[PDB]
Amino acid sequence: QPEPDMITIFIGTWNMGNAPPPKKITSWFLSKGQGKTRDDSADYIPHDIYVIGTQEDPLSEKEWLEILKHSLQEITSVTFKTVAIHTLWNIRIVVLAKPEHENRISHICTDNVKTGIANTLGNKGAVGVSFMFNGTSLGFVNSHLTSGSEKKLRRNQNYMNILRFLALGDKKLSPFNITHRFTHLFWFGDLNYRVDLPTWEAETIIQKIKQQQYADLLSHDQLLTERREQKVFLHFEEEEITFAPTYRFERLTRDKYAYTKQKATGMKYNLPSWCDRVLWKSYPLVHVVCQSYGSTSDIMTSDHSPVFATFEAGVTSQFVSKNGPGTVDSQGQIEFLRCYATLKTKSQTKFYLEFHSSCLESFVKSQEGENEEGSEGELVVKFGETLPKLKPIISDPEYLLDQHILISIKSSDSDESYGEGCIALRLEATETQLPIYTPLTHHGELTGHFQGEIKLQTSQ
């Protein structure tokens, strides 16, 4: 029974509007409705993993698990195993997997983050799940961000709090937040970014939606504009949106957008918006392909429509050799040549690097670099040919070329990371000096760059 090198992952996000679901929700899990939809010929083919995020979920965990599992069994004739379920207030994440995957899944973690302070603490935040699928780490975040058209900055702040404080994946990766801990990270939810057009244009926007003409609406979507200005979700991907805004509908039909201000809305307008989103970030040169991204048309209990996204995702096997795990393999080495970090910091400590990777027995600290001044004001930290030779546990190129090195640049004075990045070992050649590059971030914001050359020796 061979180990897979690809899986498919279903991601769902639905703000249920505090109402029970209708009796049939199968269109959601089938990626049917509007947008990039799944071929009818695939309807009986189960996804390997289903990750369901809800917001404003009124159900108990048990109630929702029974609906989800019975839905999937009706579609696929497979009884899915529950990997994890975690709820914060009315924000929930469920992970289901095909039974064949039970002994491929391990290291399951769950956590939550509550956003805001006093007034603004009490219903917004995020839940998440991580686990290993054979040799591949997977992370999943369902967030319900702050609502309201004039709170895009609060949403951006909610995002940074969630990525700083959500404790998922390998705790030994101490310098790294969730945006670096996983081979594949999926971040979805009621992100609550709005189409930023004047209130007076509500009926114009509705007209455009009825004509399926989204371009002049998407050019005002706050999440796209904030992402293009590097204010949020730096280094994440999103499929092109080709479905109608998923909020705010009159319940029990999809024929009407309910946008006008009401006491129940705090006297706020809810112009039609793409509140409900799926984004991802995968390590460099790992296979990830979005195969659906859309909304259902036939689930109408909520003022939001459910959103689906599906992905092909590359996975690796749990590799054993005669040597590692449990020792090094002397036929393997990773060398860094001519490396330097460019940092945006105004500070003047010395810096050292840490290299973290599950291809090493443990993380490696470098010597301090040599600080120089860049021609445009920058700090340049030079490592030269001084970096420690990395000793991987396994030399086989079928393993090593699929690995990644996480890099943190840390202050000698404080041992605090000033920037984190990731280098793929999926090189064009071995035993050959090749350029490498990663941007460096801290708290998910750009703090600099790391570049140089690599020389990878495998057993071949």
Q: Which of 254, 295, 255, 249 is nearest to 272 (CA)?
A: 249
The smaller minimum CB distance to ligand WNP, of residues 133 and 233, is found at 133
The nearest distance, CB 102 to ligand WNP, in angstroms, is 4
**322 exposed, middle or buried (CB, 10 Å; 0-12, 13-18, 19+)?**
exposed
Contact of 272 with 259, CB cutoff 8 Å: yes
Pairing of strands 136-144, 184-190: parallel
4 binds ligand WNP (CB under 6 A): no
The nearest distance, CB 217 to ligand WNP, in angstroms, is 40
The smaller minimum CB distance to ligand WNP, of residues 106 and 347, is found at 106
* Choices 37-45, 76-84, 186-194, 371-379 (CB under 6 A): range interacting with ligand WNP: 76-84
Number of residues that bind ligand WNP (CB under 6 A): 9
Helices (H), 229-309: none
C-alpha to C-alpha distance for 221 and 202, rounded to whole angstroms: 14
78 binds ligand WNP (CB under 6 A): no
> Contacting ligand WNP (CB under 6 A), which of 39, 66, 74, 102?
102
The smaller minimum CB distance to ligand WNP, of residues 81 and 382, is found at 81
The DSSP result for 149-177, as a single string, is: TT-HHHHHHHHHHHHHH---S-TT-TT--
Q: Which of 227, 148, 245 is nearest to 192 (CA)?
A: 148
105 binds ligand WNP (CB under 6 A): yes
* Residue recorded with tokens 């109630």: 63
The smaller minimum CB distance to ligand WNP, of residues 107 and 251, is found at 107
84 binds ligand WNP (CB under 6 A): yes
Phi, psi (rounded to 5 degrees) for 117: -145, 130
The nearest distance, CB 81 to ligand WNP, in angstroms, is 4
Eight-state DSSP code of residue 26: H
> Contacting ligand WNP (CB under 6 A), which of 97, 205, 217, 360?
97
Pairing of strands 333-343, 6-15: unpaired
81 binds ligand WNP (CB under 6 A): yes
Hey, which residues between 307 and 366 contact ligand WNP (CB under 6 A)? Answer: none
The smaller minimum CB distance to ligand WNP, of residues 61 and 378, is found at 61
C-alpha to C-alpha distance for 28 and 334, rounded to whole angstroms: 45
* Choices 52-60, 94-102, 360-368, 439-447 (CB under 6 A): range interacting with ligand WNP: 94-102
CA angle, 237 as apex, 231 and 243 as ends, to 5°? 100
The smaller minimum CB distance to ligand WNP, of residues 170 and 368, is found at 170
**423 exposed, middle or buried (CB, 10 Å; 0-12, 13-18, 19+)?**
buried
72 binds ligand WNP (CB under 6 A): no
101 binds ligand WNP (CB under 6 A): yes
203 binds ligand WNP (CB under 6 A): no
* Choices 34-42, 81-89, 135-143, 329-337 (CB under 6 A): range interacting with ligand WNP: 81-89
The nearest distance, CB 105 to ligand WNP, in angstroms, is 4
Residues binding ligand WNP (CB under 6 A): 81-84, 97, 101-102, 105, 108
